[PDB]
């Protein structure tokens, strides 16, 4: 029927920079404006924009990145580098935060969830290389 699905890892109830476009999009919750910012794929830009982004806005930026990856996993990779750089640049600020798991619960579930593929995928790659090794030599 209309029953809602959930998982046990749901810790919810327990130049060239676009920094200013990002900050405005995040403050106003403008998904369309945010989506344009996330479209850039140059790692050089990503560090610069996050470098100048205010630490207060950095914590909540991690929240959108978690939600957007969760809705579409195929963007997990490109969106990961933003989470990578946000934690690098604002790591010290994030330490001085009274709770992280509750406010970053979606990220942990998203990152926890994706890792479970690594064991099973390696099982394929061995089976999978075995047949590959067979027909190239043949």
């Amino acid at each position: 029927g209309n029953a809602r699905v959930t998982s046990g890892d749901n810790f919810k109830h327990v130049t060239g920079t676009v920094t200013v476009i990002l900050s405005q999009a995040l403050q106003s919750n403008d998904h369309s404006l945010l989506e344009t910012v996330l479209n850039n794929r140059d790692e050089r830009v990503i560090r610069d924009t996050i470098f100048r982004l205010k630490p207060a806005l950095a914590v909540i930026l991690l929240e959108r990145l978690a939600e957007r990856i969760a809705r579409q996993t195929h963007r997990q990779g490109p969106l990961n580098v933003w989470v990578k750089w946000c934690l690098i640049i604002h790591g010290g600020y994030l330490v001085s935060i009274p709770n992280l798991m509750s406010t970053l619960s979606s990220l942990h579930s998203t990152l926890k969830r994706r890792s479970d593929l690594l064991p099973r995928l390696l099982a394929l790659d061995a089976r999978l290389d075995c047949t590959i090794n067979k027909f190239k030599t043949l």
């Binding site: 959930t6 046990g8 327990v14």
Partner: protein, 757 residues
């Protein structure tokens, strides 16, 4: 003070003789076709067909003669042979009992005894005042003798006279009229048909003639017969095969006709009274009425179980009587008797007893024969080996749990059985099933599993319980991936929350949690929260790693939410996790491996002694009252007063409970009332000169703090489970599927004549 008394019934009685096929049914319809009589293992129930309720019950316990005699009923015959609601019961030993339904059972029935010399009575039958009896005498094949029975009024005795004797009878069947018998013998094999009261029909022929040359070329399953049917007139005989092929043979000229739709071994074949129709059923759970005139077939699919036996029951074939197996439960053979109206093929009357699921198989229960040996079935060769292995296991081995989970409804007091992928709701007050609800996804009624499909395992409900208030049901289930796949080892753990307003009988699903506590981690224990915290609207979940989570229904969310959590990521593993909660609602007693912990609910952490070590691993932790806590380890049980933190009483459990039962069965065997005291149940195998099949059970009532034994009482069978009903009384389920309970003028003449007229 206390006393034990049997309350509910048991499984339906069946003619469990391997040779006879198609004559499994002993239940019978009245001559007026207004009520149906079903003998059970411990009683006989008469159900009025039109209203679909049990009008009358006859308990063997109530009658002294039946209590002493009950040996199982081999047949029932309407009326009394010696002589309008009389019925005669024939049991295997030979006792003949004339009793009366539609009235008050007479304490002195017309008990009689047939004289048999080393013969086990198998079947009886009549056509018009003439009675013949079939009996068993002893290559692993039982032989059969046909005798004539007559009641002499001078001596008031049943005299038995010999008519015939057939040897090494493999399979046997009787016509619907009850005047012809077809049997198969090894004298590979030969089938012979004989008239019973007359000499008209006497024919025999080797099975090789009927079998096809290809059938000889192919495997033994093609040559292996599973069922047979014989016509009333005798011209046609149907032979089923393990491959699922049916062969109709014309006896006059031994010509064969192949009817093949069943893809697995055909289990039940029955001819119609006229013979124009063949009724067939097997593993497919689908009923096939073959129209022989044009070789068509009508289908009634999605019968609840596999069809064991089939009969057309009526002067005009108005009703069909069917037997369903429910092979999904390997622990016990679950028979359900279904009377369908032929007019619309709708269920006129469905009768079945309580259907508990035990951890391991019991007594001599054997899976039905299939084309291949599977988890739910036995192959041709697997039958004897499985029987021998089962006997040798239950004798030699020490692990004999046979324990079943059961739940009670606080609002309704109605009994819930967690069947495989389903819940049976059974009312023991009335001793009748109220509901059967499938509580999981998977193949439960989508289709009938056959061949390799039968190896699939459906989702298994392991824990089923309610909140105190009773509006909420919490279900923990395990989904098993298929074999021969990469993801064939990642068992899925699912939780569901289910509520139902009292007037309905069907729950509607509100919440479902996938993989609680993470991935591949079982939910070892559950505990619903009490009235104090959240008004019985919360509950707790515990793993084998000691991780604890509290869920609760959030009104704003309109659903359940993980209020609170603790994951001590313990590397070590133990399936024995016991959980107790205080009535006020402050603490948690969490017993993991050998250590008990007192965790404060507000901080959800050890109280700031919280840690209590035990000699061995905890199976149960419970508090009889707020002041005293009872903890059972695998070697003993100990009463601890929290107020002083010193042990009151220590009872040594090792002599009876060492490794017989898996961890966690102590939970469902040990039960406690909230006011008077607790009860301890200990079962032990009885043996005279190596261990014997039968078991013997002691029930001991103990006061709070285990100071004194209120009452020690004895039961003559393995009590699978015991629990505390919300009344004083405790209900116990016994492997006989038996729920017992331990608890404290001219006008007058004219009116009579008018009534007669």
């Amino acid at each position: 003070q206390y006393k034990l008394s049997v309350v509910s019934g048991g499984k339906p009685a069946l003619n469990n003789l391997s040779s006879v096929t198609g004559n499994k049914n002993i239940a019978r319809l009245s001559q007026d076709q207004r009520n149906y009589i079903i003998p059970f293992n411990n009683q006989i129930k008469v159900y009025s067909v039109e209203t679909r309720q049990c009008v009358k019950t006859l308990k063997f316990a109530n009658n002294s003669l039946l209590s002493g005699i009950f040996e199982s009923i081999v047949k029932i015959l309407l009326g009394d042979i010696t002589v309008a609601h009389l019925i005669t019961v024939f049991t295997n030993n030979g006792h003949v009992i004339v009793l009366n339904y539609k009235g008050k059972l007479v304490e002195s029935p017309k008990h009689f005894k047939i004289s048999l010399a080393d013969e086990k009575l198998a079947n009886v039958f009549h056509s018009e005042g003439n009675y013949r009896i079939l009996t068993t005498f002893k290559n692993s094949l039982q032989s059969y003798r046909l005798y004539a029975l007559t009641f002499d009024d001078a001596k008031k005795q049943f005299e038995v006279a010999h008519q015939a004797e057939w040897h090494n009878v493999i399979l046997s069947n009787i016509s619907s009229n009850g005047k012809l018998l077809a049997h198969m013998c090894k004298d590979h094999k030969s089938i012979s048909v004989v008239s019973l009261f007359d000499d008209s029909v006497n024919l025999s022929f080797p099975l090789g003639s009927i079998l096809s040359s290809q059938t000889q070329s192919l495997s033994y399953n093609t040559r292996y017969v599973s069922s047979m049917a014989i016509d009333n007139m005798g011209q046609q005989l149907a032979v089923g095969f393990a491959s699922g092929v049916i062969s109709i043979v014309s006896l006059a000229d031994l010509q064969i006709r192949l009817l093949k739709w069943h893809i697995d071994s055909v289990l039940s074949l029955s001819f119609s009274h006229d013979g124009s129709y063949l009724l067939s059923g097997g593993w497919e759970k689908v009923m096939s009425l073959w129209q022989l005139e044009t070789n068509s077939q009508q289908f009634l699919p999605r019968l609840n179980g596999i069809i064991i036996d089939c009969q057309v029951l009526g002067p005009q074939g108005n009703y069909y009587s069917l037997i369903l197996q429910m092979t999904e439960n390997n622990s016990n053979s679950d028979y359900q008797f279904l009377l369908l109206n032929a007019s619309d093929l709708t269920s006129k009357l469905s009768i079945n007893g309580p259907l508990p699921v035990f951890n391991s198989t019991i007594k001599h229960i054997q899976q039905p024969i299939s084309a291949m040996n599977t988890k739910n079935s036995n192959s041709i060769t697997s039958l004897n080996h499985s029987k021998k292995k089962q006997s040798r296991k239950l004798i030699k081995s020490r692990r004999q749990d046979f324990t079943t989970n059961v739940e009670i409804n606080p609002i309704n007091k109605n009994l819930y059985f967690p069947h495989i992928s389903a819940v049976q709701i059974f009312d023991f007050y009335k001793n009748e099933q109220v509901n059967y609800q499938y509580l999981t996804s998977g193949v439960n009624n989508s289709m009938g599993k056959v061949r390799f499909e039968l190896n699939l395992q459906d989702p298994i409900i392991t824990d089923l319980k309610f909140t105190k208030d009773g509006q909420w049901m919490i279900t923990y289930e395990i989904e098993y991936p298929p074999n021969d796949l990469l993801s064939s080892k990642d068992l899925t753990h699912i939780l569901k929350f289910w509520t139902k307003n009292d007037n309905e009988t069907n729950w509607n699903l509100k919440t479902k949690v996938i993989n609680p506590h993470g991935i591949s981690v079982p939910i070892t224990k559950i505990l619903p929260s009490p009235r104090s915290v959240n008004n019985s609207q919360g509950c707790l979940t515990a793993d084998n790693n000691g991780g604890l989570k509290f869920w609760s229904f959030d009104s704003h969310e309109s659903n359940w939410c993980l209020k609170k959590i603790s994951l001590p990521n313990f590397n070590h593993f133990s399936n024995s996790v016991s959980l107790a909660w205080s009535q006020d609602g402050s603490l948690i007693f969490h017993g993991f491996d050998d250590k008990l912990q007192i965790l404060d609910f507000d901080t959800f952490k050890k109280f700031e002694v919280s840690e209590f070590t035990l000699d061995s691993e905890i199976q149960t932790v419970k508090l009889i009252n707020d002041t005293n806590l009872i903890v059972a380890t695998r070697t003993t049980l100990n009463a601890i007063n929290l107020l002083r933190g010193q042990v009151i009483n220590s009872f040594d459990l090792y002599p009876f409970v060492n490794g017989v039962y898996k961890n966690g069965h102590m939970d469902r065997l040990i039960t406690c009332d909230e006011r008077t005291g607790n009860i301890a149940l200990v079962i032990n195998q009885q043996l005279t000169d190596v261990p014997t099949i039968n078991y013997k059970s002691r029930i001991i009532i103990f006061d709070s703090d285990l100071s004194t034994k209120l009452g020690n009482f004895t039961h003559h069978e393995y009590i699978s489970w015991i629990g505390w009903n919300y009344d004083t009384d405790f209900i116990f389920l016994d492997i006989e599927s038996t729920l017992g309970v331990v608890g404290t003028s001219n006008s007058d003449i004219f009116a009579e004549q008018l009534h007669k007229l």
